[PDB]
PDB file of all heavy atoms in Angstrom:
ATOM      1  N   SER A 659       0.800  -1.221   0.000  1.00  0.00           N
ATOM      2  CA  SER A 659       0.000   0.000   0.000  1.00  0.00           C
ATOM      3  C   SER A 659       0.838   1.279   0.000  1.00  0.00           C
ATOM      4  O   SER A 659       0.267   2.354  -0.189  1.00  0.00           O
ATOM      5  CB  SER A 659      -0.928   0.020   1.202  1.00  0.00           C
ATOM      6  OG  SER A 659      -0.156  -0.043   2.374  1.00  0.00           O
ATOM      7  N   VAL A 660       2.153   1.203   0.218  1.00  0.00           N
ATOM      8  CA  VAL A 660       3.021   2.372   0.101  1.00  0.00           C
ATOM      9  C   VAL A 660       3.949   2.304  -1.100  1.00  0.00           C
ATOM     10  O   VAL A 660       4.632   3.300  -1.394  1.00  0.00           O
ATOM     11  CB  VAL A 660       3.848   2.598   1.386  1.00  0.00           C
ATOM     12  CG1 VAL A 660       2.934   2.593   2.629  1.00  0.00           C
ATOM     13  CG2 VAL A 660       4.941   1.565   1.511  1.00  0.00           C
ATOM     14  N   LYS A 661       3.976   1.196  -1.826  1.00  0.00           N
ATOM     15  CA  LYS A 661       4.908   1.068  -2.933  1.00  0.00           C
ATOM     16  C   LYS A 661       4.649   2.158  -3.970  1.00  0.00           C
ATOM     17  O   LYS A 661       3.511   2.383  -4.396  1.00  0.00           O
ATOM     18  CB  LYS A 661       4.812  -0.311  -3.580  1.00  0.00           C
ATOM     19  CG  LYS A 661       6.011  -0.589  -4.480  1.00  0.00           C
ATOM     20  CD  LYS A 661       5.991  -1.980  -5.037  1.00  0.00           C
ATOM     21  CE  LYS A 661       7.143  -2.170  -6.027  1.00  0.00           C
ATOM     22  NZ  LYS A 661       7.233  -3.582  -6.461  1.00  0.00           N
ATOM     23  N   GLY A 662       5.725   2.805  -4.401  1.00  0.00           N
ATOM     24  CA  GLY A 662       5.644   3.879  -5.360  1.00  0.00           C
ATOM     25  C   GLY A 662       5.422   5.249  -4.746  1.00  0.00           C
ATOM     26  O   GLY A 662       5.566   6.263  -5.460  1.00  0.00           O
ATOM     27  N   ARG A 663       5.027   5.304  -3.479  1.00  0.00           N
ATOM     28  CA  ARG A 663       4.841   6.547  -2.727  1.00  0.00           C
ATOM     29  C   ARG A 663       5.917   6.785  -1.687  1.00  0.00           C
ATOM     30  O   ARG A 663       6.334   7.918  -1.494  1.00  0.00           O
ATOM     31  CB  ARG A 663       3.474   6.542  -2.038  1.00  0.00           C
ATOM     32  CG  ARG A 663       2.311   6.390  -2.999  1.00  0.00           C
ATOM     33  CD  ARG A 663       0.947   6.585  -2.316  1.00  0.00           C
ATOM     34  NE  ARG A 663       0.701   5.638  -1.237  1.00  0.00           N
ATOM     35  CZ  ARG A 663       0.598   5.953   0.057  1.00  0.00           C
ATOM     36  NH1 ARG A 663       0.689   7.208   0.449  1.00  0.00           N
ATOM     37  NH2 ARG A 663       0.370   5.003   0.968  1.00  0.00           N
ATOM     38  N   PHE A 664       6.396   5.727  -1.032  1.00  0.00           N
ATOM     39  CA  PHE A 664       7.400   5.802   0.017  1.00  0.00           C
ATOM     40  C   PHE A 664       8.729   5.271  -0.505  1.00  0.00           C
ATOM     41  O   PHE A 664       8.767   4.291  -1.261  1.00  0.00           O
ATOM     42  CB  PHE A 664       7.000   4.961   1.237  1.00  0.00           C
ATOM     43  CG  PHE A 664       5.851   5.518   2.088  1.00  0.00           C
ATOM     44  CD1 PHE A 664       4.999   6.524   1.646  1.00  0.00           C
ATOM     45  CD2 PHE A 664       5.625   4.966   3.347  1.00  0.00           C
ATOM     46  CE1 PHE A 664       3.950   6.973   2.470  1.00  0.00           C
ATOM     47  CE2 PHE A 664       4.597   5.382   4.145  1.00  0.00           C
ATOM     48  CZ  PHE A 664       3.748   6.387   3.715  1.00  0.00           C
ATOM     49  N   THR A 665       9.828   5.886  -0.074  1.00  0.00           N
ATOM     50  CA  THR A 665      11.161   5.401  -0.414  1.00  0.00           C
ATOM     51  C   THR A 665      11.982   5.288   0.856  1.00  0.00           C
ATOM     52  O   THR A 665      12.125   6.271   1.586  1.00  0.00           O
ATOM     53  CB  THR A 665      11.872   6.336  -1.394  1.00  0.00           C
ATOM     54  OG1 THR A 665      11.145   6.428  -2.626  1.00  0.00           O
ATOM     55  CG2 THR A 665      13.272   5.809  -1.678  1.00  0.00           C
ATOM     56  N   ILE A 666      12.487   4.085   1.144  1.00  0.00           N
ATOM     57  CA  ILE A 666      13.422   3.881   2.247  1.00  0.00           C
ATOM     58  C   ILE A 666      14.851   4.032   1.715  1.00  0.00           C
ATOM     59  O   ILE A 666      15.196   3.580   0.606  1.00  0.00           O
ATOM     60  CB  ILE A 666      13.183   2.509   2.930  1.00  0.00           C
ATOM     61  CG1 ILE A 666      14.039   2.371   4.175  1.00  0.00           C
ATOM     62  CG2 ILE A 666      13.432   1.345   1.973  1.00  0.00           C
ATOM     63  CD1 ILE A 666      13.701   1.108   5.025  1.00  0.00           C
ATOM     64  N   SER A 667      15.678   4.751   2.469  1.00  0.00           N
ATOM     65  CA  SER A 667      17.073   4.960   2.085  1.00  0.00           C
ATOM     66  C   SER A 667      17.898   5.080   3.354  1.00  0.00           C
ATOM     67  O   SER A 667      17.363   5.162   4.459  1.00  0.00           O
ATOM     68  CB  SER A 667      17.283   6.202   1.207  1.00  0.00           C
ATOM     69  OG  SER A 667      17.000   7.419   1.930  1.00  0.00           O
ATOM     70  N   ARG A 668      19.217   5.069   3.182  1.00  0.00           N
ATOM     71  CA  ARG A 668      20.115   5.166   4.325  1.00  0.00           C
ATOM     72  C   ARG A 668      21.397   5.878   3.913  1.00  0.00           C
ATOM     73  O   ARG A 668      21.787   5.883   2.734  1.00  0.00           O
ATOM     74  CB  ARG A 668      20.450   3.780   4.908  1.00  0.00           C
ATOM     75  CG  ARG A 668      21.274   2.885   3.975  1.00  0.00           C
ATOM     76  CD  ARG A 668      21.256   1.433   4.450  1.00  0.00           C
ATOM     77  NE  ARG A 668      21.847   1.245   5.778  1.00  0.00           N
ATOM     78  CZ  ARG A 668      21.548   0.237   6.602  1.00  0.00           C
ATOM     79  NH1 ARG A 668      20.656  -0.680   6.252  1.00  0.00           N
ATOM     80  NH2 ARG A 668      22.142   0.137   7.785  1.00  0.00           N
ATOM     81  N   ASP A 669      22.034   6.512   4.895  1.00  0.00           N
ATOM     82  CA  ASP A 669      23.373   7.085   4.735  1.00  0.00           C
ATOM     83  C   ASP A 669      24.242   6.470   5.832  1.00  0.00           C
ATOM     84  O   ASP A 669      24.207   6.912   6.985  1.00  0.00           O
ATOM     85  CB  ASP A 669      23.317   8.609   4.817  1.00  0.00           C
ATOM     86  CG  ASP A 669      24.681   9.286   4.613  1.00  0.00           C
ATOM     87  OD1 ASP A 669      25.729   8.615   4.715  1.00  0.00           O
ATOM     88  OD2 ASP A 669      24.701  10.519   4.373  1.00  0.00           O
ATOM     89  N   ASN A 670      24.992   5.420   5.489  1.00  0.00           N
ATOM     90  CA  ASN A 670      25.801   4.745   6.493  1.00  0.00           C
ATOM     91  C   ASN A 670      26.889   5.656   7.040  1.00  0.00           C
ATOM     92  O   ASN A 670      27.271   5.521   8.206  1.00  0.00           O
ATOM     93  CB  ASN A 670      26.387   3.464   5.910  1.00  0.00           C
ATOM     94  CG  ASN A 670      25.332   2.395   5.750  1.00  0.00           C
ATOM     95  OD1 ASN A 670      24.266   2.477   6.378  1.00  0.00           O
ATOM     96  ND2 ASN A 670      25.606   1.386   4.914  1.00  0.00           N
ATOM     97  N   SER A 671      27.368   6.617   6.241  1.00  0.00           N
ATOM     98  CA  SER A 671      28.405   7.517   6.736  1.00  0.00           C
ATOM     99  C   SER A 671      27.899   8.366   7.891  1.00  0.00           C
ATOM    100  O   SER A 671      28.707   8.872   8.675  1.00  0.00           O
ATOM    101  CB  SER A 671      28.942   8.416   5.611  1.00  0.00           C
ATOM    102  OG  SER A 671      28.064   9.491   5.302  1.00  0.00           O
ATOM    103  N   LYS A 672      26.579   8.481   8.048  1.00  0.00           N
ATOM    104  CA  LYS A 672      25.975   9.269   9.113  1.00  0.00           C
ATOM    105  C   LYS A 672      25.151   8.396  10.058  1.00  0.00           C
ATOM    106  O   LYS A 672      24.412   8.929  10.896  1.00  0.00           O
ATOM    107  CB  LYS A 672      25.079  10.374   8.534  1.00  0.00           C
ATOM    108  CG  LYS A 672      25.770  11.433   7.650  1.00  0.00           C
ATOM    109  CD  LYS A 672      24.757  12.507   7.207  1.00  0.00           C
ATOM    110  CE  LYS A 672      25.313  13.453   6.125  1.00  0.00           C
ATOM    111  NZ  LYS A 672      26.400  14.304   6.628  1.00  0.00           N
ATOM    112  N   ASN A 673      25.241   7.077   9.924  1.00  0.00           N
ATOM    113  CA  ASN A 673      24.436   6.139  10.706  1.00  0.00           C
ATOM    114  C   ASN A 673      22.962   6.553  10.754  1.00  0.00           C
ATOM    115  O   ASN A 673      22.325   6.517  11.808  1.00  0.00           O
ATOM    116  CB  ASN A 673      25.004   6.007  12.122  1.00  0.00           C
ATOM    117  CG  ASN A 673      26.236   5.122  12.180  1.00  0.00           C
ATOM    118  OD1 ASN A 673      26.430   4.252  11.341  1.00  0.00           O
ATOM    119  ND2 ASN A 673      27.076   5.347  13.176  1.00  0.00           N
ATOM    120  N   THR A 674      22.408   6.936   9.595  1.00  0.00           N
ATOM    121  CA  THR A 674      21.041   7.440   9.534  1.00  0.00           C
ATOM    122  C   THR A 674      20.208   6.691   8.506  1.00  0.00           C
ATOM    123  O   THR A 674      20.656   6.417   7.391  1.00  0.00           O
ATOM    124  CB  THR A 674      21.024   8.946   9.228  1.00  0.00           C
ATOM    125  OG1 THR A 674      21.783   9.613  10.229  1.00  0.00           O
ATOM    126  CG2 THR A 674      19.592   9.528   9.254  1.00  0.00           C
ATOM    127  N   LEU A 675      18.979   6.400   8.896  1.00  0.00           N
ATOM    128  CA  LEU A 675      17.972   5.783   8.053  1.00  0.00           C
ATOM    129  C   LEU A 675      16.881   6.809   7.755  1.00  0.00           C
ATOM    130  O   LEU A 675      16.559   7.652   8.604  1.00  0.00           O
ATOM    131  CB  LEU A 675      17.379   4.563   8.768  1.00  0.00           C
ATOM    132  CG  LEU A 675      16.283   3.749   8.101  1.00  0.00           C
ATOM    133  CD1 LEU A 675      16.871   2.880   7.025  1.00  0.00           C
ATOM    134  CD2 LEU A 675      15.509   2.880   9.083  1.00  0.00           C
ATOM    135  N   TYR A 676      16.325   6.755   6.550  1.00  0.00           N
ATOM    136  CA  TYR A 676      15.320   7.723   6.113  1.00  0.00           C
ATOM    137  C   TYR A 676      14.091   7.004   5.591  1.00  0.00           C
ATOM    138  O   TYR A 676      14.181   5.905   5.035  1.00  0.00           O
ATOM    139  CB  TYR A 676      15.841   8.613   4.993  1.00  0.00           C
ATOM    140  CG  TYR A 676      17.084   9.347   5.362  1.00  0.00           C
ATOM    141  CD1 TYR A 676      18.329   8.874   4.947  1.00  0.00           C
ATOM    142  CD2 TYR A 676      17.029  10.491   6.136  1.00  0.00           C
ATOM    143  CE1 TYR A 676      19.484   9.528   5.280  1.00  0.00           C
ATOM    144  CE2 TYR A 676      18.190  11.166   6.481  1.00  0.00           C
ATOM    145  CZ  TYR A 676      19.415  10.677   6.051  1.00  0.00           C
ATOM    146  OH  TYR A 676      20.583  11.331   6.381  1.00  0.00           O
ATOM    147  N   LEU A 677      12.957   7.689   5.678  1.00  0.00           N
ATOM    148  CA  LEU A 677      11.736   7.273   5.005  1.00  0.00           C
ATOM    149  C   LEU A 677      11.158   8.519   4.345  1.00  0.00           C
ATOM    150  O   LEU A 677      10.688   9.440   5.026  1.00  0.00           O
ATOM    151  CB  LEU A 677      10.733   6.633   5.969  1.00  0.00           C
ATOM    152  CG  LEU A 677       9.507   6.051   5.270  1.00  0.00           C
ATOM    153  CD1 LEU A 677       9.881   4.848   4.401  1.00  0.00           C
ATOM    154  CD2 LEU A 677       8.406   5.653   6.285  1.00  0.00           C
ATOM    155  N   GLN A 678      11.243   8.566   3.025  1.00  0.00           N
ATOM    156  CA  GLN A 678      10.649   9.640   2.239  1.00  0.00           C
ATOM    157  C   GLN A 678       9.214   9.237   1.924  1.00  0.00           C
ATOM    158  O   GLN A 678       8.988   8.215   1.263  1.00  0.00           O
ATOM    159  CB  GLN A 678      11.446   9.865   0.958  1.00  0.00           C
ATOM    160  CG  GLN A 678      10.880  10.977   0.094  1.00  0.00           C
ATOM    161  CD  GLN A 678      11.021  12.350   0.712  1.00  0.00           C
ATOM    162  OE1 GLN A 678      12.039  12.692   1.332  1.00  0.00           O
ATOM    163  NE2 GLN A 678      10.001  13.156   0.531  1.00  0.00           N
ATOM    164  N   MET A 679       8.247  10.033   2.388  1.00  0.00           N
ATOM    165  CA  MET A 679       6.836   9.725   2.220  1.00  0.00           C
ATOM    166  C   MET A 679       6.233  10.780   1.294  1.00  0.00           C
ATOM    167  O   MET A 679       6.085  11.944   1.672  1.00  0.00           O
ATOM    168  CB  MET A 679       6.112   9.670   3.580  1.00  0.00           C
ATOM    169  CG  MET A 679       6.698   8.642   4.505  1.00  0.00           C
ATOM    170  SD  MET A 679       5.783   8.566   6.075  1.00  0.00           S
ATOM    171  CE  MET A 679       6.218  10.069   6.745  1.00  0.00           C
ATOM    172  N   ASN A 680       5.901  10.365   0.077  1.00  0.00           N
ATOM    173  CA  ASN A 680       5.265  11.230  -0.915  1.00  0.00           C
ATOM    174  C   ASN A 680       3.806  10.831  -1.118  1.00  0.00           C
ATOM    175  O   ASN A 680       3.378   9.739  -0.736  1.00  0.00           O
ATOM    176  CB  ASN A 680       6.021  11.153  -2.238  1.00  0.00           C
ATOM    177  CG  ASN A 680       7.460  11.631  -2.121  1.00  0.00           C
ATOM    178  OD1 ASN A 680       7.761  12.647  -1.468  1.00  0.00           O
ATOM    179  ND2 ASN A 680       8.354  10.925  -2.797  1.00  0.00           N
ATOM    180  N   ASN A 681       3.027  11.747  -1.692  1.00  0.00           N
ATOM    181  CA  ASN A 681       1.609  11.511  -1.964  1.00  0.00           C
ATOM    182  C   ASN A 681       0.895  10.948  -0.735  1.00  0.00           C
ATOM    183  O   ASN A 681       0.195   9.937  -0.815  1.00  0.00           O
ATOM    184  CB  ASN A 681       1.417  10.550  -3.142  1.00  0.00           C
ATOM    185  CG  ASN A 681       2.074  11.021  -4.420  1.00  0.00           C
ATOM    186  OD1 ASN A 681       2.321  12.213  -4.622  1.00  0.00           O
ATOM    187  ND2 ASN A 681       2.341  10.071  -5.314  1.00  0.00           N
ATOM    188  N   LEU A 682       1.060  11.610   0.411  1.00  0.00           N
ATOM    189  CA  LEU A 682       0.565  11.044   1.656  1.00  0.00           C
ATOM    190  C   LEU A 682      -0.957  11.029   1.676  1.00  0.00           C
ATOM    191  O   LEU A 682      -1.624  11.862   1.069  1.00  0.00           O
ATOM    192  CB  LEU A 682       1.119  11.824   2.843  1.00  0.00           C
ATOM    193  CG  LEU A 682       2.509  11.362   3.324  1.00  0.00           C
ATOM    194  CD1 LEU A 682       3.258  12.476   4.039  1.00  0.00           C
ATOM    195  CD2 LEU A 682       2.371  10.150   4.223  1.00  0.00           C
ATOM    196  N   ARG A 683      -1.500  10.039   2.373  1.00  0.00           N
ATOM    197  CA  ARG A 683      -2.929   9.805   2.444  1.00  0.00           C
ATOM    198  C   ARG A 683      -3.363   9.776   3.901  1.00  0.00           C
ATOM    199  O   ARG A 683      -2.562   9.545   4.800  1.00  0.00           O
ATOM    200  CB  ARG A 683      -3.311   8.479   1.789  1.00  0.00           C
ATOM    201  CG  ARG A 683      -2.924   8.326   0.330  1.00  0.00           C
ATOM    202  CD  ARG A 683      -3.007   6.848  -0.061  1.00  0.00           C
ATOM    203  NE  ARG A 683      -2.775   6.647  -1.483  1.00  0.00           N
ATOM    204  CZ  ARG A 683      -2.550   5.465  -2.050  1.00  0.00           C
ATOM    205  NH1 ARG A 683      -2.501   4.359  -1.312  1.00  0.00           N
ATOM    206  NH2 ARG A 683      -2.363   5.399  -3.360  1.00  0.00           N
ATOM    207  N   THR A 684      -4.658   9.984   4.121  1.00  0.00           N
ATOM    208  CA  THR A 684      -5.186   9.989   5.478  1.00  0.00           C
ATOM    209  C   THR A 684      -4.795   8.726   6.221  1.00  0.00           C
ATOM    210  O   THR A 684      -4.364   8.785   7.384  1.00  0.00           O
ATOM    211  CB  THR A 684      -6.715  10.142   5.431  1.00  0.00           C
ATOM    212  OG1 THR A 684      -7.035  11.368   4.752  1.00  0.00           O
ATOM    213  CG2 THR A 684      -7.307  10.163   6.840  1.00  0.00           C
ATOM    214  N   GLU A 685      -4.903   7.575   5.563  1.00  0.00           N
ATOM    215  CA  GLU A 685      -4.620   6.300   6.217  1.00  0.00           C
ATOM    216  C   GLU A 685      -3.130   6.042   6.436  1.00  0.00           C
ATOM    217  O   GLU A 685      -2.777   5.006   7.028  1.00  0.00           O
ATOM    218  CB  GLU A 685      -5.257   5.172   5.421  1.00  0.00           C
ATOM    219  CG  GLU A 685      -4.694   4.976   4.044  1.00  0.00           C
ATOM    220  CD  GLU A 685      -5.422   5.762   2.944  1.00  0.00           C
ATOM    221  OE1 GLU A 685      -6.133   6.798   3.206  1.00  0.00           O
ATOM    222  OE2 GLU A 685      -5.263   5.323   1.783  1.00  0.00           O
ATOM    223  N   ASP A 686      -2.248   6.949   6.020  1.00  0.00           N
ATOM    224  CA  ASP A 686      -0.853   6.888   6.448  1.00  0.00           C
ATOM    225  C   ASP A 686      -0.633   7.505   7.829  1.00  0.00           C
ATOM    226  O   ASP A 686       0.495   7.474   8.341  1.00  0.00           O
ATOM    227  CB  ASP A 686       0.033   7.602   5.428  1.00  0.00           C
ATOM    228  CG  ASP A 686       0.001   6.951   4.055  1.00  0.00           C
ATOM    229  OD1 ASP A 686      -0.014   5.689   3.936  1.00  0.00           O
ATOM    230  OD2 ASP A 686      -0.004   7.714   3.070  1.00  0.00           O
ATOM    231  N   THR A 687      -1.668   8.098   8.422  1.00  0.00           N
ATOM    232  CA  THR A 687      -1.568   8.609   9.786  1.00  0.00           C
ATOM    233  C   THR A 687      -1.205   7.478  10.736  1.00  0.00           C
ATOM    234  O   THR A 687      -1.890   6.455  10.761  1.00  0.00           O
ATOM    235  CB  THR A 687      -2.901   9.238  10.192  1.00  0.00           C
ATOM    236  OG1 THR A 687      -3.121  10.427   9.427  1.00  0.00           O
ATOM    237  CG2 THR A 687      -2.920   9.629  11.667  1.00  0.00           C
ATOM    238  N   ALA A 688      -0.137   7.666  11.518  1.00  0.00           N
ATOM    239  CA  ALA A 688       0.383   6.607  12.386  1.00  0.00           C
ATOM    240  C   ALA A 688       1.584   7.099  13.179  1.00  0.00           C
ATOM    241  O   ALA A 688       2.175   8.151  12.895  1.00  0.00           O
ATOM    242  CB  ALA A 688       0.807   5.373  11.597  1.00  0.00           C
ATOM    243  N   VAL A 689       1.915   6.322  14.205  1.00  0.00           N
ATOM    244  CA  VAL A 689       3.237   6.354  14.812  1.00  0.00           C
ATOM    245  C   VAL A 689       4.159   5.521  13.934  1.00  0.00           C
ATOM    246  O   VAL A 689       3.871   4.348  13.652  1.00  0.00           O
ATOM    247  CB  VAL A 689       3.208   5.789  16.244  1.00  0.00           C
ATOM    248  CG1 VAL A 689       4.641   5.760  16.818  1.00  0.00           C
ATOM    249  CG2 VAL A 689       2.273   6.555  17.139  1.00  0.00           C
ATOM    250  N   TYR A 690       5.284   6.105  13.536  1.00  0.00           N
ATOM    251  CA  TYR A 690       6.286   5.448  12.710  1.00  0.00           C
ATOM    252  C   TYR A 690       7.509   5.136  13.560  1.00  0.00           C
ATOM    253  O   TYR A 690       8.070   6.035  14.190  1.00  0.00           O
ATOM    254  CB  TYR A 690       6.688   6.337  11.522  1.00  0.00           C
ATOM    255  CG  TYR A 690       5.642   6.329  10.433  1.00  0.00           C
ATOM    256  CD1 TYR A 690       4.462   7.056  10.579  1.00  0.00           C
ATOM    257  CD2 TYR A 690       5.815   5.588   9.280  1.00  0.00           C
ATOM    258  CE1 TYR A 690       3.478   7.032   9.608  1.00  0.00           C
ATOM    259  CE2 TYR A 690       4.843   5.553   8.315  1.00  0.00           C
ATOM    260  CZ  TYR A 690       3.675   6.281   8.472  1.00  0.00           C
ATOM    261  OH  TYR A 690       2.724   6.199   7.475  1.00  0.00           O
ATOM    262  N   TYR A 691       7.903   3.862  13.576  1.00  0.00           N
ATOM    263  CA  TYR A 691       9.093   3.366  14.238  1.00  0.00           C
ATOM    264  C   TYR A 691      10.157   2.946  13.240  1.00  0.00           C
ATOM    265  O   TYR A 691       9.852   2.350  12.209  1.00  0.00           O
ATOM    266  CB  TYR A 691       8.796   2.110  15.059  1.00  0.00           C
ATOM    267  CG  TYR A 691       7.766   2.268  16.135  1.00  0.00           C
ATOM    268  CD1 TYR A 691       6.445   1.932  15.906  1.00  0.00           C
ATOM    269  CD2 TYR A 691       8.118   2.733  17.385  1.00  0.00           C
ATOM    270  CE1 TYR A 691       5.494   2.054  16.902  1.00  0.00           C
ATOM    271  CE2 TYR A 691       7.180   2.847  18.397  1.00  0.00           C
ATOM    272  CZ  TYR A 691       5.874   2.510  18.140  1.00  0.00           C
ATOM    273  OH  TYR A 691       4.940   2.594  19.147  1.00  0.00           O
ATOM    274  N   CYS A 692      11.413   3.260  13.528  1.00  0.00           N
ATOM    275  CA  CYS A 692      12.458   2.514  12.855  1.00  0.00           C
ATOM    276  C   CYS A 692      12.868   1.356  13.748  1.00  0.00           C
ATOM    277  O   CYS A 692      12.689   1.386  14.967  1.00  0.00           O
ATOM    278  CB  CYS A 692      13.650   3.390  12.497  1.00  0.00           C
ATOM    279  SG  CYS A 692      14.355   4.332  13.827  1.00  0.00           S
ATOM    280  N   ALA A 693      13.366   0.297  13.122  1.00  0.00           N
ATOM    281  CA  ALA A 693      13.680  -0.916  13.861  1.00  0.00           C
ATOM    282  C   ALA A 693      14.654  -1.786  13.084  1.00  0.00           C
ATOM    283  O   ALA A 693      14.638  -1.821  11.853  1.00  0.00           O
ATOM    284  CB  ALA A 693      12.401  -1.710  14.175  1.00  0.00           C
ATOM    285  N   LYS A 694      15.511  -2.493  13.826  1.00  0.00           N
ATOM    286  CA  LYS A 694      16.421  -3.455  13.213  1.00  0.00           C
ATOM    287  C   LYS A 694      15.697  -4.729  12.765  1.00  0.00           C
ATOM    288  O   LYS A 694      15.948  -5.240  11.658  1.00  0.00           O
ATOM    289  CB  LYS A 694      17.538  -3.778  14.199  1.00  0.00           C
ATOM    290  CG  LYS A 694      18.601  -4.761  13.697  1.00  0.00           C
ATOM    291  CD  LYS A 694      19.578  -5.031  14.845  1.00  0.00           C
ATOM    292  CE  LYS A 694      20.512  -6.178  14.581  1.00  0.00           C
ATOM    293  NZ  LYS A 694      19.792  -7.470  14.553  1.00  0.00           N
ATOM    294  N   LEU A 695      14.814  -5.256  13.615  1.00  0.00           N
ATOM    295  CA  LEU A 695      14.108  -6.523  13.409  1.00  0.00           C
ATOM    296  C   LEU A 695      15.116  -7.661  13.235  1.00  0.00           C
ATOM    297  O   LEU A 695      16.325  -7.482  13.441  1.00  0.00           O
ATOM    298  CB  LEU A 695      13.127  -6.435  12.218  1.00  0.00           C
ATOM    299  CG  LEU A 695      12.052  -5.332  12.307  1.00  0.00           C
ATOM    300  CD1 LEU A 695      10.976  -5.526  11.260  1.00  0.00           C
ATOM    301  CD2 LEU A 695      11.368  -5.277  13.684  1.00  0.00           C
ATOM    302  N   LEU A 696      14.637  -8.854  12.875  1.00  0.00           N
ATOM    303  CA  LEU A 696      15.460 -10.056  12.950  1.00  0.00           C
ATOM    304  C   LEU A 696      15.653 -10.751  11.615  1.00  0.00           C
ATOM    305  O   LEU A 696      16.117 -11.898  11.593  1.00  0.00           O
ATOM    306  CB  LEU A 696      14.847 -11.050  13.940  1.00  0.00           C
ATOM    307  CG  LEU A 696      14.644 -10.491  15.367  1.00  0.00           C
ATOM    308  CD1 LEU A 696      13.960 -11.554  16.215  1.00  0.00           C
ATOM    309  CD2 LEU A 696      15.955 -10.039  16.015  1.00  0.00           C
ATOM    310  N   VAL A 697      15.290 -10.125  10.494  1.00  0.00           N
ATOM    311  CA  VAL A 697      15.521 -10.807   9.218  1.00  0.00           C
ATOM    312  C   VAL A 697      17.007 -11.098   9.068  1.00  0.00           C
ATOM    313  O   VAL A 697      17.856 -10.217   9.268  1.00  0.00           O
ATOM    314  CB  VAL A 697      15.002  -9.958   8.054  1.00  0.00           C
ATOM    315  CG1 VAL A 697      15.093 -10.775   6.749  1.00  0.00           C
ATOM    316  CG2 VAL A 697      13.568  -9.456   8.313  1.00  0.00           C
ATOM    317  N   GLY A 698      17.337 -12.341   8.703  1.00  0.00           N
ATOM    318  CA  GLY A 698      18.716 -12.745   8.494  1.00  0.00           C
ATOM    319  C   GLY A 698      19.576 -12.951   9.729  1.00  0.00           C
ATOM    320  O   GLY A 698      20.793 -13.106   9.581  1.00  0.00           O
ATOM    321  N   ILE A 699      19.006 -12.988  10.940  1.00  0.00           N
ATOM    322  CA  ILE A 699      19.837 -13.176  12.135  1.00  0.00           C
ATOM    323  C   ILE A 699      20.590 -14.519  12.106  1.00  0.00           C
ATOM    324  O   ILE A 699      20.133 -15.527  11.538  1.00  0.00           O
ATOM    325  CB  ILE A 699      19.041 -13.061  13.454  1.00  0.00           C
ATOM    326  CG1 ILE A 699      17.829 -14.002  13.450  1.00  0.00           C
ATOM    327  CG2 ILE A 699      18.650 -11.601  13.715  1.00  0.00           C
ATOM    328  CD1 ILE A 699      17.210 -14.254  14.828  1.00  0.00           C
TER     329      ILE A 699
END
């Protein structure tokens, strides 16, 4: 539901993760967390 509107990116030189949210919609209203999670542990 966000494909084509949201872009995830990172700058490792600054230890920073980004979420660019374009064409925002009412149902994108939320608390947004960044997280490591466990994929590939």
Side-chain angles (χ1 to χ4, degrees):
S659 60
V660 309
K661 195 175 175 173
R663 302 188 300 114
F664 288 15
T665 299
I666 187 172
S667 66
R668 66 195 298 155
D669 182 343
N670 287 341
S671 78
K672 298 183 190 293
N673 282 335
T674 303
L675 179 76
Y676 303 99
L677 186 67
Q678 180 68 39
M679 301 182 291
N680 298 318
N681 303 337
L682 274 155
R683 302 164 174 167
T684 301
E685 65 269 22
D686 297 320
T687 292
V689 177
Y690 283 76
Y691 301 96
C692 53
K694 181 184 169 292
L695 303 192
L696 303 177
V697 187
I699 53 164

